[PDB]
Amino acid sequence: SMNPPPPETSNPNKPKRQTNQLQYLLRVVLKTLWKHQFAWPFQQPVDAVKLNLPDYYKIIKTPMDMGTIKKRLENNYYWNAQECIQDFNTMFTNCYIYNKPGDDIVLMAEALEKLFLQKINELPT
Ligand SMILES: Cc1cc(/N=N/c2ccc(C(=O)Nc3ccccc3N)cc2)c2cc[nH]c2c1O
């Protein structure tokens, strides 16, 4: 296919380890962005076939989306909160480097990123 397999979301051999930062990332950060009116383009991996972006996966080396992030948090895939924050950053970067400024998708990403950064400013210690 033109699309890669979706990013892995489970680590069967990683110990289960909770942190209050990971709790905050799921219950505050992800939850707030997931319910936002602009979340929908970001709730699943980019399907370059259905969306007619044939060059997407030639330009975007590390695909990322909030559906993947949500499942990773639910599955305790991340060893630490910084790994999760990096995935959010990657998702936004992909959008900004692939799409044209002023495309509706970019304005939607920017609104979500603003909310993301506001919540990250209150990440517990
Ligand atoms: C991250 C990202 C996502 C992108 N579109 N993601 C979409 C997802 C669902 C949809 C969708 O269900 N649309 C709909 C709306 C009302 C009723 C039915 C449907 N099927 C569209 C785009 C695009 C497009 C261009 N660059 C994109 C990009 O960088």
Swiss-Prot record:
Compartments annotated for it: namely: Nucleus; Chromosome
Q: Site Acetylated histone binding: give positions.
A: N99
Tissue-level expression = Ubiquitously expressed.
Q: Which domain of life is it from?
A: Eukaryota
Post-translational modifications: Phosphorylation by CK2 disrupt the intramolecular binding between the bromo domain 2 and the NPS region and promotes binding between the NPS and the BID regions, leading to activate the protein and promote binding to acetylated histones. In absence of phosphorylation, BRD4 does not localize to p53/TP53 target gene promoters, phosphorylation promoting recruitment to p53/TP53 target promoters.
Pinpoint the Glycyl lysine isopeptide (Lys-Gly) (interchain with G-Cter in SUMO2) cross-link.
K58
Q: Which family does it belong to?
A: Belongs to the BET family.
Q: What is known of its domains?
A: The NET domain mediates interaction with a number of chromatin proteins involved in transcription regulation (NSD3, JMJD6, CHD4, GLTSCR1 and ATAD5). The C-terminal (CTD) region mediates interaction and recruitment of CDK9 and CCNT1 subunits of the P-TEFb complex. It is also required for maintenance of higher-order chromatin structure.
The disorder on record is: Cornelia de Lange syndrome 6: A form of Cornelia de Lange syndrome, a clinically heterogeneous developmental disorder associated with malformations affecting multiple systems. It is characterized by facial dysmorphisms, abnormal hands and feet, growth delay, cognitive retardation, hirsutism, gastroesophageal dysfunction and cardiac, ophthalmologic and genitourinary anomalies. CDLS6 inheritance is autosomal dominant. A chromosomal aberration involving BRD4 is found in a rare, aggressive, and lethal carcinoma arising in midline organs of young people. Translocation t(15;19)(q14;p13) with NUTM1 which produces a BRD4-NUTM1 fusion protein.
Q: How does it assemble?
A: Interacts with p53/TP53; the interaction is direct. Interacts (via CTD region) with CDK9 and CCNT1, acting as an associated component of P-TEFb complex. Interacts with RELA (when acetylated at 'Lys-310'). Interacts (via NET domain) with NSD3, CHD4, BICRA and ATAD5. The interaction with BICRA bridges BRD4 to the GBAF complex. Interacts (via NET domain) with JMJD6 (via JmjC and N-terminal domains); the interaction is stronger in presence of ssRNA and recruits JMJD6 on distal enhancers. Interacts with NSD3. Interacts with NIPBL.
Name this polypeptide is given: Bromodomain-containing protein 4
